């Protein structure tokens, strides 16, 4: 009650740069290492599960999300704001495209969306930018897989590889000599569970790991049958068993 | 009730009973069914009592606010479209007003709008307004002169007011008279339809149909 | 920093205070109340040449028998005084009569110190005081003929005479010499004359000050040229005799 | 009914307006001109309603002459017209619709084209060689059916209005005092100064 | 040099409020007023400054019903505000209730009307002290009202300028003023000594003089000009 | 009094083999009086078809209004819309004035430009989808339309079959309607092209 | 709800983000109007901070308001659009409910009252911008002219001038017009504004805007080349010395 | 009190400039550069990428330009996500304007709001501008094609010619010197690349760096097209030219 800031929070410095929006890039320089990958027939987003106290449980700790059976995302900086961004998200896909075209948003729009929503926080009265990047990977029928980053300034740029957070320079140099457009989302998946290793600084395994892709339709996970015309979801978080199983290679 | 105004060469002749009725019962014979505006303009009352007796006294207020902003004085043109905008506003709310705003400036003549609560404004030479208009009509259309003498003028416009207060049962009490001039209106008296009808009856000829 | 509304230690509204100076920068406007009327002057202060003299407006009618003078930043005044004008039509539309002169003055007082950033009760709405100041003039049948001035503190006197602007301490001393409760008219309109001429900056002439009286035969009427001109040449006269 | 008739031919548009106004039992006026200039070249008639119809065209003029000065340009009769039906569509579902039907005749000095418009209260605009508010078409649609031709010059067009005219003095149970007319063509707007 | 009095909603550190202190100052800076009351009577004498020999006295007496009024030292459009939202209170009880508002009463109206302004952003408090008599249920009344919201009963007292002359003078004869009842010309006379001590250094003129008076035979009425040369 | 048919007029939709047709009279009346021959009622939005039968005013404001959101559409999705989707669009905006409805009947028509796959569906007023792959009927003589389909009607006709087909249950149809009549159109529609026959009727 | 008081006093009775408006004021490219016996010309400065500009489509410096008076302004350039359109507005409304056009004086006081607002309104600040207003009244031969100040001030000018030195072109004006001899034809009114405009804005034919208000609605821009005729007159009358 | 954190955006400067703004024209100088070119027979509109990397997806990405009309497109340097809010008001008043009056907006009309809202912010609601500077290319019947350029304090001009971001001294003075009026789009296109290859803040000038857009007539008089190129139509053209 009585929220007198109506003015804006995030201003022009003499020297041209918005301070709080450098300030929050910042904040998520120094988030944990998250990646992605664009493969043939997939995409792969990647994070590291870093464990405060080993009391802390793993699962707990999503970095990875479901936002549309077609649609990931991951993040590096801090993470209540993602918590929250992912909220405002899968409400906008349903508010602003589900319940006015039937069907869900094509990945880039869904992005252009989460970047209206983080831009307005740099220009609205009385609030700070959001201190998170995100990753955000998914195939809609017509622009078929894609692989997206926004920024807390508001701007989104599409990626064949990229990486954010702590190890992202190290991680971006290694991703652009493993990157050909040739690889099956496979061996994406092993480009990336190496990429994680040399950011990861201890222990290395499918319950410190967090893994996605987006690829084929999985009518194994849809929960119902009889209309062929609705496959599964092409979203799928990969198990610990699963990212142990091909943690030997 | 019958009001009538019209414009000749020697400005505007403004002429009204005063009966109002409520039922069959006559509430009053002495109604006042001209207001004033101010010393340059003269409204007509019929339809709603106090809608006409506000409204155009609030016409009033709003008139001189535009002579102390603009210094100078307001057209009837403008005076009345006043009156009929916020009419307008009101439109099925239920006001009841049919009225002639009447006014002499040097840009316009003698002007007269018709007012009513339909949201019409029309400015015209002759009007009659009422139960009795149409009597009043018959009297003013067949001797209607533009060249009338100010005498005569208003002569036509009290024998007009008789000839309705005679036939309509809703209309009689007495005339009221006023002469617009464009240095203003003068008042030419309030004359009782009792006294008028005999002395007209006898000195004209006219209602031969009657005993006296 | 701090509020548009706040105290001095001595207890002065600053904003208030501060624009009790910008009144002192403005033209210098002049009242005298005798019993044959009111008179009002100002001093018209054009910045150029090309100027037309005409169109500067500091005197100007409230209603039939109230006057009003400003000075100070005279844009400020405009919604004063419609305030005021609206004030004492719609009193004759509520009351069939005209609005006390004191009555009047003290709405359009309401009016100052209605200004803030959100002083919880309804609306202050204004970002500041305003910056000018009236002499009000005007006649009623209760009080008489009256003098008042309206200061951006919501605060009003009554004067027999005033003076406001630059030079209204000059002239203010010249009028509590001059002034007695038995002033013709025709002597208070030669007086104002004076006590212009001597804090204008410029000469004294028809086309650089101007004159205003309240009578209530005729209630509020303002002086052309060749009207007031006549007066400057009957006052150099009067000054020219031991 | 008031009448309001339209007629497009060759290079110009004619509009014919009745000239009564008529309040309960009495004819209050018998010189009335239901029409307001939009454009240059642009005319409106209005029938309907008794407060809606002038409201509803002032507040029309008033728009299309904001445009026009803010521009530097005439809107053109298409534009003027779409903007019209757009107005009307809004109020159909307002508190209280203006109850106004519209005729627009306009010469498109672009196109140099003559147009001419018709939209009803409720915002059905169409395009019509010839068209008429109210009972107006009852009478005399058949005549227009037969003798209108696309290429008529202006004075064919107000001989066939005649025509007109008179079926609509003979049939029609109303005296509506005779009719106003009007041309637009690309030297703007002129009121013809006898008719009938 | 502190930075603690920008507006009403910081306390310092030692948990004052310096706005409020401040437009206690505007008070002590307005003309004395003086009130004080009987059992049957209670008396407002104030003294209304002018501004030149050209101008008026400021009226510092304002009628709040006709069993209650006030007077005011300091900022006077703030008495305005203050006594017209009396005015309403006092009708309220009148209209809703057909009951005179008690003077206590108003008394907590007007404190909580003024705490508000002291608790709350971009306000500032009201910058007028207030005596208020009246003549209630319970007899005779005397308020003294601070823009802090503090209102305290009294038989009498006095504010404004050099009030602690009259103040000091009521508080020795306050033995004698009090048992003047069915007497009021008297408890006038006794209103106008006390105000007597604050003249530094002028006479009490008519022009400068006002009394009001309220008691069990009597309406709030307001006494100026000719009507008070009887007391001088 | 009957929103619906003050102005007459009607729609009839059919699909074919890899093509569909949509088709519509030209009158546009107030109620017994015929005041336009040329009252269109077919639409379209890229390659997808809209046919708006019901209340005059209405149909040209509904026409207006997916003109302008199939645009922004466009401009955002770097695609045109697909009969499938704009058909969403119209239930959901017609279902956002449930409570004071847009009085008309839609009927969408279109080749699916990835699947190639003919659609058609149509509405009521208020926005509920009738998707069959047969016929979709709309107007003044809808009844008429729906005895006319259901008797001519073939699964798979080629187009210029189909054409035959639509027509003459159009044709017949309208000329059961006093409402109805004064001219019509028949679109013909491929994932190719698509052609656009005026009718021959009578005008009465 | 953003209402933070911007414009405020300081204690020597000064507004200071009204007086800082004048200096967006100065800043801005000079204008000048004169009025004639039977007309008023409108002069105005091209900026000539670049070229490639396209002539035909920039906005041009000079309004018309209605079809008998026109506005123009110095100062920041998106600021004078605002107040241009709330003009406008004010000139057709006026029209529909007083079915007359407005006198120049009232839509001058109408533009100053505007600016006045917006002086003395939390959340917003002055309008970097002076005005320059003309043109005849309704059915009136007489020619007006009157200037408006971000303060809300406004008057009435035989001639005068606001911008860039405009000072300096005061200057000339208050000693180069004979208030008992004004330019008594549209020439004559026509030169003494380039006179004026010419010794401040250096050569530039390209660089100077002129346009014309006469009674009745006759409003005309001129071509440079008509300006062109009038710079070259001079200065062989001049280059006569 | 919370009056202390307010940087309050929209004052005057004591030489009577807005803070923000001139601060904002700072920001934009900063952004890749972008050049609008108009021909007899068509506009040019060319823009260079700030960033990118190898990894960068060149088809899929947009920066620079964007449709509003299909007559009227827009460069942009600045703030992206500022211009989207922009761009996104802009679209829906062209379709506003369309639904109104059934023609599509004269460039200019829509160029106008779009200056007016950035105005607003500089004079109320206490919120920063948008750091963002435009340059509009369009047709319409009134004026045919035109060239427009706006900035953050919603001031608008028309061009033959212009530059915005960066380096923009260097870049008016190049199209300065070859900009001719009987210029063809062929002449135009080639002028914009070879002063983009002049003023770039890097080591030559490749396709994938480079965002290109053409408004022409084409085959059909009365139509006109809005070609968006594709990053091999831009390497294609870069051949053709004296580079690659
Ligand atoms: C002279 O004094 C008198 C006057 C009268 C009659 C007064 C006439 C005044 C003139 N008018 C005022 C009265 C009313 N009037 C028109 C009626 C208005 C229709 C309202 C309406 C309702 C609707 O329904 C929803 C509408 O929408 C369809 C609508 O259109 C928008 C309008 C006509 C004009 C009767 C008297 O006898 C007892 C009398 O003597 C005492």
Redesign the pocket.
């Known amino acids: 009650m009585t929220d007198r800031y109506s003015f804006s929070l995030t201003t022009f410095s003499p020297s041209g740069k918005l301070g709080q929006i450098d300030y929050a890039l910042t904040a998520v320089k120094q988030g944990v290492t998250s990646l992605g990958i664009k493969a043939t027939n997939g995409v792969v987003i990647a994070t590291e599960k870093k464990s405060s106290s080993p009391l802390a449980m793993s699962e707990t700790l999503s970095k990875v999300s479901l936002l549309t059976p077609d649609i990931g995302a991951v993040y590096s900086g801090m993470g209540p704001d993602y918590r929250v961004l992912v909220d405002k998200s899968r409400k906008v896909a349903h508010t602003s495209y589900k319940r006015i075209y039937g069907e869900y948003p094509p990945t880039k729009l869904l992005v252009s969306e989460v970047a209206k929503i983080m831009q307005e926080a740099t220009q609205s009265g009385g609030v700070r930018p959001f201190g998170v990047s995100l990753l955000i990977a998914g195939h809609d029928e017509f622009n078929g897989f894609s692989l997206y980053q926004v920024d807390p300034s508001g701007s989104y740029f599409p990626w064949k590889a990229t990486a954010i957070g702590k190890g992202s320079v190290a991680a971006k140099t290694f991703l652009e000599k493993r990157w050909n457009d040739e690889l099956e989302l496979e061996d994406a998946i092993h480009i990336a569970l190496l990429t994680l290793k040399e950011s990861v600084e201890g222990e290395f395994n499918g319950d410190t790991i967090e893994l996605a892709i987006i690829g084929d339709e999985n009518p194994d996970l849809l929960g119902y049958t009889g209309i062929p015309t609705d496959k599964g979801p092409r979203f799928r978080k990969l198990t610990s068993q699963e990212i142990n199983d091909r943690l030997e290679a | 009730?019958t009001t009538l105004a019209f414009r000749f060469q020697g400005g505007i002749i403004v002429a009204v009973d005063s009966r109002?009725?409520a039922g069959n019962w006559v509430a009053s014979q002495t109604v006042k069914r001209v207001i004033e505006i101010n010393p340059f303009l003269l409204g007509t009352m019929?339809?709603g009592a106090a809608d006409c007796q506000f409204w155009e006294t609030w016409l009033g207020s709003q008139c001189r606010l535009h002579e102390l902003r603009e210094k100078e004085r307001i057209s009837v043109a403008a005076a009345s479209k006043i009156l009929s905008n916020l009419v307008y506003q009101y439109?099925?709310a239920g006001l009841?007003?049919?009225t002639m705003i009447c006014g002499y400036t040097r840009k316009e003549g003698p002007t007269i709008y018709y007012v009513?609560?339909?949201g019409t404004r029309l400015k015209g030479d002759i009007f009659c307004?009422?139960?009795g208009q149409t009597f009043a009509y018959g009297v003013l259309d067949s001797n209607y002169k533009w060249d009338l003498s100010v005498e005569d003028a208003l002569y036509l416009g009290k024998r007009s007011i008789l000839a309705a207060a005679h036939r309509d049962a809703?209309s009689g009490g007495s005339v009221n008279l006023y002469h617009v001039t464009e240095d203003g209106w003068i008042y030419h008296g309030n004359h009782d339809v009792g006294e008028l009808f005999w002395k007209v009856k006898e000195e004209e000829g006219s209602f031969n149909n009657v005993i006296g | 920093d701090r509020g548009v509304s706040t105290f001095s230690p001595e207890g002065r509204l600053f904003q208030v205070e501060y624009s009790l100076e910008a009144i002192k920068l403005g033209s210098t406007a002049i009242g005298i109340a005798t019993k044959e009327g009111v008179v009002l002057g100002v001093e018209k202060r054009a910045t150029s040449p090309l100027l037309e003299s005409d169109s500067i407006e500091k005197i100007v009618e409230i209603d039939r028998h109230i006057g009003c003078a400003m000075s100070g930043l005279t844009a400020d005044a405009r919604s004063m005084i419609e305030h005021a004008r609206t004030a004492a039509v719609t009193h004759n539309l509520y009351y069939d009569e005209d609005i006390n002169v004191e009555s009047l003055t003290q709405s359009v007082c309401d009016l100052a110190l209605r200004f803030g950033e959100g002083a919880s009760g309804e609306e202050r709405l204004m970002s500041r005081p305003f910056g000018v100041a009236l002499l009000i003039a005007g006649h009623d049948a209760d009080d008489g003929y009256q003098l008042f001035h309206a200061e951006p503190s919501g605060t009003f006197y009554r004067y027999n005479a005033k003076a406001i602007g630059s030079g209204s301490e000059g002239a203010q001393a010249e009028l509590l010499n001059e002034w007695h409760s038995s002033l013709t008219l025709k002597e208070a309109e030669l007086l104002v004359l004076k006590i212009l001429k001597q804090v204008m900056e410029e000469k004294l002439d028809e086309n650089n000050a101007q004159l205003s009286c309240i009578t209530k035969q005729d209630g509020f009427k303002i002086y052309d040229n060749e009207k007031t001109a006549e007066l400057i040449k009957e006052l150099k006269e009067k000054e020219a005799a031991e | 009914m008031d009448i309001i008739l339209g007629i497009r031919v060759q290079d110009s548009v004619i509009l014919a307006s009745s000239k009564a106004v008529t309040?309960?039992i009495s004819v209050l006026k018998d010189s009335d001109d239901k029409t307001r200039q939009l454009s240059p070249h642009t005319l409106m008639s209005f029938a309907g309603?008794a407060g809606?119809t002038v409201q509803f065209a002032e507040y029309i003029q008033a728009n299309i002459q904001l445009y026009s000065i803010r521009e530097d340009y005439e809107l053109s009769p298409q534009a003027v017209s779409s903007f019209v039906r757009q107005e009307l569509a809004k109020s159909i579902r307002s508190r209280?619709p203006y109850?106004v039907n519209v005729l627009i005749g306009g010469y498109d000095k672009k196109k140099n084209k003559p147009e001419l418009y018709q939209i009803d209260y409720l915002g059905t605009k169409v395009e019509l060689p010839y068209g008429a508010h109210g009972y107006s078409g009852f009478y005399t649609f058949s005549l227009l059916d037969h003798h209108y031709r696309p290429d008529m010059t202006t004075e064919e067009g107000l001989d066939l209005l005649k025509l007109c005219v008179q079926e609509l003095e003979k049939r029609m149970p109303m005296d509506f005092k005779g009719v106003i007319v009007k041309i637009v063509d690309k030297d703007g707007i002129r009121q013809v100064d006898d008719f009938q | 040099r502190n930075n603690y009095d920008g507006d009403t909603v910081t306390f310092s550190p030692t948990g004052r409020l310096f706005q409020v202190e401040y437009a206690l100052e505007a008070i002590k800076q307005g003309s004395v007023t003086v009130g004080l009351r009987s059992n049957t009577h209670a008396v407002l004498v104030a003294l209304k400054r002018n501004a030149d020999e050209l101008s008026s006295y400021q009226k510092k007496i304002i009628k709040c019903d006709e069993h209650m009024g006030l007077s005011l030292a300091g900022l006077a459009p703030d008495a305005r505000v203050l006594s017209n939202y009396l005015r309403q209170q006092c009708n309220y009880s009148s209209l809703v209730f057909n009951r005179k508002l008690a003077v206590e009463r108003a008394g907590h109206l007007l404190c909580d009307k003024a705490q508000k302004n002291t608790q709350s952003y971009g306000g500032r408090p009201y910058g007028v002290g207030l005596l208020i008599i009246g003549y209630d249920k319970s007899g005779a009344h005397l308020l003294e009202f601070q823009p802090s919201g503090n209102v305290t009963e009294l038989y009498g007292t006095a504010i404004g300028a050099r009030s602690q002359g009259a103040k000091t003078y009521l508080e020795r004869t306050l033995d004698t003023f009090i048992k003047i009842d069915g007497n009021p010309d008297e408890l006038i006379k006794a209103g106008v000594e006390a105000i007597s001590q604050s003249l530094r250094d002028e006479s009490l003129t008519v022009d400068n003089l006002s009394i009001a008076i309220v008691g069990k035979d009597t309406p709030f009425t307001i006494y100026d000009g000719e009507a008070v040369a009887k007391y001088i | 009094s009957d929103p619906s048919s003050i102005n007459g007029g009607i729609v009839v939709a059919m699909t074919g083999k890899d093509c569909v047709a949509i088709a519509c009279d030209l009158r546009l009346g107030s109620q017994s009086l015929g005041v336009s021959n040329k009252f269109e009622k077919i639409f379209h939005y890229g390659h997808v078809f809209l046919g708006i039968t019901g209340l005059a005013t209405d149909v040209t404001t509904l026409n207006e209004m997916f003109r302008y959101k199939t645009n922004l559409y466009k401009l955002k999705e770097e695609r045109a819309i697909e009969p499938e989707t704009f058909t969403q669009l119209v239930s959901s905006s017609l279902y956002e004035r449930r409570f004071g409805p847009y009085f008309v009947g839609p009927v969408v028509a279109g080749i699916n430009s990835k699947s190639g796959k003919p659609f058609i569906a149509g509405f009521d007023l208020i926005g509920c989808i009738d998707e069959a792959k047969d016929f979709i009927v709309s107007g003044t003589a809808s009844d008429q339309l729906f005895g006319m389909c259901e008797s001519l009607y073939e699964p798979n006709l080629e187009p210029e079959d189909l054409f035959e087909t639509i027509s003459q249950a159009l044709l017949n149809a309208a000329d059961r309607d006093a409402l109805s009549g004064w001219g019509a159109v028949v679109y013909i529609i491929k994932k190719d092209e698509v052609v656009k026959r005026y009718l021959k009727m009578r005008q009465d | 709800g953003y209402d933070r008081a911007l414009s405020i006093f300081s204690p020597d009775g000064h507004i200071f983000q009204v007086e800082y408006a004048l200096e967006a004021v100065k800043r801005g490219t000079c204008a000048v109007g004169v009025k004639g016996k039977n007309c008023v010309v409108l002069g105005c400065e091209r900026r000539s901070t670049l070229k490639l500009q396209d002539t035909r489509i920039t906005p041009s410096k000079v309004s018309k308001i209605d079809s008998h008076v026109v506005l123009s302004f110095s100062g920041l350039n998106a600021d004078s659009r605002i107040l241009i359109e709330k003009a406008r507005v004010e000139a057709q409304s006026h029209r529909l409910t007083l079915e007359d056009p407005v006198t120049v004086e009232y839509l001058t006081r109408y533009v100053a009252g505007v600016q006045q607002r917006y002086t003395q309104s939390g959340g917003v600040r002055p309008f970097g911008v002076s005005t320059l207003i003309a043109g005849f009244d309704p059915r009136d031969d007489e020619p007006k002219l009157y200037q408006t100040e971000p303060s809300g001030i406004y008057s009435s000018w035989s001639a005068q001038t606001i911008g860039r030195n405009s000072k300096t072109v005061r200057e000339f004006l208050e000693k180069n017009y004979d208030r008992k001899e004004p330019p008594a034809t549209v020439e004559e009114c026509v030169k003494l504004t380039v006179r004026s405009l010419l010794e401040v804005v250096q050569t530039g034919a390209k660089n100077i805007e002129i346009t014309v208000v006469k009674p009745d609605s006759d409003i005309v821009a001129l071509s440079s080349e008509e300006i062109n005729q009038y710079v070259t007159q001079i200065e062989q009358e001049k280059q006569e010395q | 009190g919370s009056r202390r954190y307010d940087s309050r955006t929209t004052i005057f400067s004591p030489e009577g400039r807005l803070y923000q703004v001139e601060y904002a024209l700072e920001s934009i100088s900063h952004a890749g550069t972008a050049i609008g070119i108009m021909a007899s027979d068509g506009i040019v509109l060319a823009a260079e990428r700030k960033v990118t990397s190898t990894l960068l997806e060149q088809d899929t990405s947009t920066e620079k330009l964007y449709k509003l009309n299909d007559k009227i497109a827009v460069a942009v340097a600045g703030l992206t996500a500022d211009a989207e809010i922009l761009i996104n008001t802009a679209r829906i008043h062209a379709q506003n304007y369309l639904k109104t009056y059934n023609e599509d907006i004269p460039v200019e009309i829509l160029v106008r709001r779009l200056s007016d809202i950035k105005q607003g912010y500089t004079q109320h609601g206490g919120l920063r501008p948008f750091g963002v500077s435009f340059i509009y290319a369009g047709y319409d019947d009134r004026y045919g094609y035109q060239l427009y350029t706006s900035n953050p304090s919603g001031n608008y001009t028309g061009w033959k010619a212009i530059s915005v971001g960066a380096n923009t001294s260097a870049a008016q003075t190049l199209l300065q010197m070859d900009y001719k009026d009987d210029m063809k789009v062929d002449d135009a296109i080639e002028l914009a690349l070879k002063t983009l290859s002049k003023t770039t803040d890097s080591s030559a000038l490749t396709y994938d760096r480079l965002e290109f857009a053409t408004i022409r007539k084409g085959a059909n008089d009365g139509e006109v097209y809005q070609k968006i190129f594709k990053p091999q139509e831009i390497k294609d053209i870069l051949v053709k030219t004296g580079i690659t």
Do not use: C
């Open positions: 009730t109002a009725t019929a339809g439109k099925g009841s007003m049919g009513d609560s339909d307004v009422g139960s809703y | 309040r309960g309603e809606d209280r109850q």
